[PDB]
Amino acid sequence: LQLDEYLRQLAPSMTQWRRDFHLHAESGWLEFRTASKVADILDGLGYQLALGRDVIDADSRMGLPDEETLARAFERAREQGAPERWLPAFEGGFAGVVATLDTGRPGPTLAFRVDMDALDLCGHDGHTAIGLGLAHVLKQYAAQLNGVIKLIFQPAEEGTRGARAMVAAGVVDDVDYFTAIHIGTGVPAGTVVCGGDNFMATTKFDVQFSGVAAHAGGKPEDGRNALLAAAQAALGLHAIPPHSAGASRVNVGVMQAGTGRNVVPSSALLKVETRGESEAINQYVFERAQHVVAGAAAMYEARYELRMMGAATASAPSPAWVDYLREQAARVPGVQQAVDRIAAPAGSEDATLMMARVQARGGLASYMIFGTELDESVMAVAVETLARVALNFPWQR
């Protein structure tokens, strides 16, 4: 009741949030200020918070910035207005937060997730505002809810690095219905996909090649060309055969080698990523890749180091849950279409990891997409759609 009204009594806050978080955008694992601000507000609304290491498994964190970068980002946050009461809980690259609202009334646990990080050289993640927005709506109308509602603010989504660490921490082991959201720019403004399935499994990794000269003196017979080794690696990688079961990808997006024009290269670096339509296919591609870089290093009798930088799996939304999401989304104002599933360029999202987990444990889950192409108020329709998903839940059945 009066949800439509209350919403217009919140919109002015959300835009303020999208902008402030756009103003002080932070990269993967360095979302210190953002998490501090989110925690602050969420605690202010009376949510039971869980922070940092309690929700982010230290070990499974891939592609973390160096010890130095984590430090300045932390300090800059403290010098950026980040609340003192919370900031400390995220030091060391553990900027993450899960808010819990327990109604006391027996019932299922509904989880909604949004990422907080921006991109490195931040148009891509206005999702944090929608997360706070939904939190508010969920308090005012708390009385009509049952079971438990969980709000997940995930770090390092770019590069698919954060989800795994939150899953390893057990953040979604007690979730019955999972829903990840996204402001799809490549999606028609006014349209809403309730079953994002265009996500490929993937593996991110860097390869370091070292070719220490066999002896000093700089004699050509002692050189071990790391550059040529990575060059042959790059070719091998891209030559990996496709798979019969579905689409697959491989991309050496970055390569750095050498120190000087006249100097025989002894060091080289490759930034790679593999992808497959299914978990198995991507696993296949990654297996070959390792054989390719290993042999390439051997050719030049050079050494190599493999560094796992991130990973995600394939998405298979729960049919029933997507139906429910479609049914609710149709009534929402700005929603012109429900689509269910769409045909768009394939990509990857670590939210899939949380979905896979919830699904293996009996729950259901899906990835919602809100169109905006050809419109920064799409947050209101996202908020109402999500809020509606909870309030309208068929508690009995």
Shortest CB 210 distance to Na ion, Å: 29
212 binds a copy of itself (CB under 8 A): no
Among the listed residues 375, 363, 315, the one whose alpha carbon sits nearest the alpha carbon of residue 341: 315
Point out which span in 15-23, 92-100, 146-154, 210-218 binds a copy of itself (CB under 8 A): 210-218
4 binds Y ion (CB under 5 A): yes
Residue 192 or 234: which CB sits closer to Na ion?
192
Give the separation between CA 154 and CA 193, rounded to whole angstroms.
21
Shortest CB 347 distance to Na ion, Å: 11
Shortest CB 101 distance to Y ion, Å: 24
Q: What is the DSSP string of 217-233?
A: T--GGG---HHHHHHHH
Shortest CB 201 distance to Na ion, Å: 18
Nearest residue (beta carbon) to Y ion: 4
Point out which span in 28-36, 110-118, 185-193, 339-347 binds Na ion (CB under 5 A): 110-118
Shortest CB 23 distance to a copy of itself, Å: 24
Near Na ion by CB under 5 A: residue from 49, 56, 110, 125: 125
Write 105-108 long-range contacts (CB < 8 A, 24+).
105/145, 105/146, 105/147, 106/146, 106/147, 107/145, 107/146, 107/147, 107/148, 107/395, 108/146, 108/147, 108/148, 108/176, 108/177, 108/393
Q: Give the residue carrying structure tokens 């050809």.
A: 374
115 binds Na ion (CB under 5 A): yes
Q: Which does 157 bind (CB under 5 to 8 A by kind): Na ion, a copy of itself, Y ion, none?
A: Na ion
Among the listed residues 387, 392, 394, the one whose alpha carbon sits nearest the alpha carbon of residue 10: 387
* 122 known member of a binding site: yes
Helix/strand/coil for 258: coil
Separation in Å, CA 126 to CA 1, 116, 271: 27, 8, 28
The phi, psi pair for 69, rounded to 5°, reads -60, -40
Kindly report the CA angle at 131 between 127 and 134, in degrees rounded to 5? Answer: 135
* 243 known member of a binding site: no
Among the listed residues 345, 333, 339, 285, the one whose alpha carbon sits nearest the alpha carbon of residue 317: 339
Question: Using the 8-state DSSP alphabet, how is residue 87 labeled?
Answer: G
Residue 227 or 380: which CB sits closer to a copy of itself?
227
219 binds a copy of itself (CB under 8 A): yes
Size of the site for a copy of itself (CB under 8 A): 67
Assign residue 362 a region: left if phi > 0, alpha if psi is -120 to 50, beta otherwise? left
Contacting residues toward Y ion, per CB under 5 A: 4
Binding site membership: which residues?
122, 124, 158, 182
Contacting residues toward a copy of itself, per CB under 8 A: 159, 200, 202, 204, 215-221, 223, 225, 227-228, 230-236, 238-239, 241-244, 247-249, 251-265, 268, 271-273, 275, 284, 291-292, 294-301, 309, 345-348
Contacting residues toward Na ion, per CB under 5 A: 115, 125, 157
